[PDB]
């Protein structure tokens, strides 16, 4: 293990919105595979279904498009049509409150899913423990 094992409360029964504290954006997976953030609660591409692989491991999938959130070799988030090793994330509790998502593939590097204040996604290597960009709150849709 490269990381702690404090898990967030909750389950995967229903889809969620992943709200980023940093700029107040919801994680969005565009039909074209693009990943970013939007403040529009009405957006049809912010509804995500999480599911667990192993305990503490998840897939994050677009309910609208079926695409899986994934982080590439260069730390860029993208929408994948099929589930692959780049699609697994370590879902953890952070600051005793939020949810963080660490790239399983790149766990040793501490690459997280994160959103900038301007709503653009952070590149893996630019993320790190202690940032606001990596903090998410799962909200019901």
Task: Say how far apart CA 106 and CA 102 lie, in whole Å.
Answer: 8
Instruction: Say whether 22 counts as a known binding-site residue.
Output: yes
The answer to whether the beta carbons of residues 29 and 67 sit under 8 Å apart is yes
Residues in the chain: 141
**Greatest CA span in the chain, whole angstroms?**
38
Which ranges of the chain does DSSP label H, i.e. alpha helix? Answer: none
Task: Say how far apart CA 56 and CA 103 lie, in whole Å.
Answer: 12
**CB neighbours (10 Å) of residue 26?**
26
Please report, in range form, the residues annotated as the binding site for heparin: 22
Please report, in range form, the residues annotated as the binding site: 22
């Amino acid at each position: 293990h490269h990381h702690h094992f404090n898990l967030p409360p909750g389950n995967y029964k229903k889809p969620k919105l992943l709200y980023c504290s940093n700029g107040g954006h919801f994680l969005r997976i565009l039909p074209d595979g693009t990943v970013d953030g939007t403040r529009d609660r009405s957006d049809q591409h912010i509804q995500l279904q999480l599911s667990a692989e192993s305990v503490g491991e998840v897939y994050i999938k677009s309910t609208e498009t079926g695409q899986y959130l994934a982080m590439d070799t260069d730390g860029l988030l993208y929408g994948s049509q099929t589930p692959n090793e780049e699609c697994l994330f370590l879902e953890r509790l952070e600051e005793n409150h939020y949810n963080t998502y660490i790239s399983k593939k790149h766990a040793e590097k501490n690459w997280f899913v994160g959103l900038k204040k301007n709503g653009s996604c952070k590149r893996g290597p630019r993320t790190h423990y202690g940032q606001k960009a990596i903090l998410f709150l799962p909200l019901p849709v």
